Design a protein around this ligand. Structure first.
Ligand SMILES: [O-][O-]
Ligand SMILES: [Cu+2]
Ligand SMILES: [Cu+2]
Ligand SMILES: [Cu+2]
Ligand SMILES: [Cu+2]
Lengths: 78, 279
């Protein structure tokens, strides 16, 4: 079962998540309208391509970790 | 004679020649395709589907062949260069000579994580970050910023003592040596080092930082040390496993090499020192 969708402004960035060269994926995250690749691990944790080696519990946590990583910079699409 | 040496032991001439060869692969356009290939496998390898480069038993032979391709590209520029390795259990502080301005440069400044010194600092004009997801184009690091400490020798020894190479379900949930070295379970060796360097090393485009190669050259040495500790244990699985590269199956993207062809590193290089098997 897919996580719930979310939509908030975090650190001045719009982050959105929704159930849906890279894995044909089951959940989508966007940072200011640019899609961020995210992945779920077998234990139910999540990562994103900008914080790949550091699992976090949820897709919203991965989106927030990506906004923290970006330090205001635009994401480039994958 | 290809000998991979501990970074801490390189002479000034060897550091100079390694740096120059890496910068030339970058200038000529060849380097960035290594970054791209790695990010494509990072984004494609999944616990419940096809998995080859990561989170799977072929994590170790895949990176061994990826590093061989990179070392062969460096030797096409300067035949004397070999990949050094970073023993992050020994050389564990920001003051390690690895991070000096004559080798890889140091940590990034506090505001934006920008690396300010060494040959790969953006201000040199010689190290553009092209293949990227974070849109910034300068090398970034935050050594020790997102996790306090690198692994210790005792933690490494606890992983080297595990006798099974890997175990079903052959992914990030596995027990066994491979997943404890990779770090998705347990005290966490390889993943934690990526997190400790920070910057691009924490992302799927981690080969943007030249330290990637030295980290993986030491992960590769720990596989060799595991084999010397467990000469009776070998790669698994050994046939017919969906979505996982079995011992004698070929591996993407090369398709012309199998884990079986990569188990014995001495066909390709030796280390400065590698304990022999003992008790
Ligand atoms: O795993 O890089
Ligand atoms: Cu995907
Ligand atoms: Cu990798
Ligand atoms: Cu790695
Ligand atoms: Cu013995």
């Amino acid at each position: 079962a897919a996580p719930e969708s979310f939509d908030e402004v975090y650190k001045g960035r719009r982050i959105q998540g929704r159930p849906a060269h890279e894995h044909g994926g089951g959940y989508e995250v966007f940072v200011d309208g640019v899609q961020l690749h995210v992945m779920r691990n077998a234990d139910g944790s999540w990562i994103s391509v900008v914080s790949h080696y550091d699992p976090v519990p949820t897709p919203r946590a991965a989106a927030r970790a990506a906004v923290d990583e970006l330090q205001g910079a635009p994401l480039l699409p994958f | 004679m290809t000998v991979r040496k501990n970074q801490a032991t390189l002479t000034a001439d060897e550091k100079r020649r390694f740096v120059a060869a890496v910068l030339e692969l970058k200038r000529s356009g060849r380097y960035d395709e290594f970054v791209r290939t790695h990010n494509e496998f990072i984004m494609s390898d999944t616990d419940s589907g096809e998995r080859t480069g990561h989170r799977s038993p072929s994590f170790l032979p895949w990176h061994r062949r990826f590093l061989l391709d990179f070392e062969q590209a460096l030797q096409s520029v300067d035949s004397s260069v070999t990949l050094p390795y970073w023993d992050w259990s020994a050389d564990r502080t920001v003051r390690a000579s690895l991070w000096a301005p004559d080798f890889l440069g140091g940590t990034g400044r506090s505001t934006d994580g920008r690396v300010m010194d060494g040959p790969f600092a953006a201000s040199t004009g010689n190290w553009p970050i092209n293949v990227r997801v974070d849109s910034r184009t300068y090398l970034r690091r935050s050594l020790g910023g997102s996790v306090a400490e690198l692994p210790t020798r005792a933690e490494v020894e606890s992983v080297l003592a595990i006798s099974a190479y890997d175990l079903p379900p052959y992914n990030s949930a596995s027990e066994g040596f491979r997943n404890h070295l990779e770090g998705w379970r347990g005290v966490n060796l390889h993943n934690r080092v990526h997190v400790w360097v920070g910057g691009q090393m924490a992302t799927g485009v981690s080969p943007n930082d030249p330290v990637f190669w030295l980290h993986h050259a030491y992960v590769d040495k720990l596989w060799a040390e595991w084999q010397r500790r467990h000469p009776d244990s070998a790669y698994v699985p050994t046939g017919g496993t969906p979505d996982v590269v079995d011992l004698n199956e070929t591996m993407k993207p090369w398709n012309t090499v199998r884990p079986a062809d990569l188990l014995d590193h001495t066909a390709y290089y030796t280390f400065d020192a590698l304990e022999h098997h003992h008790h």
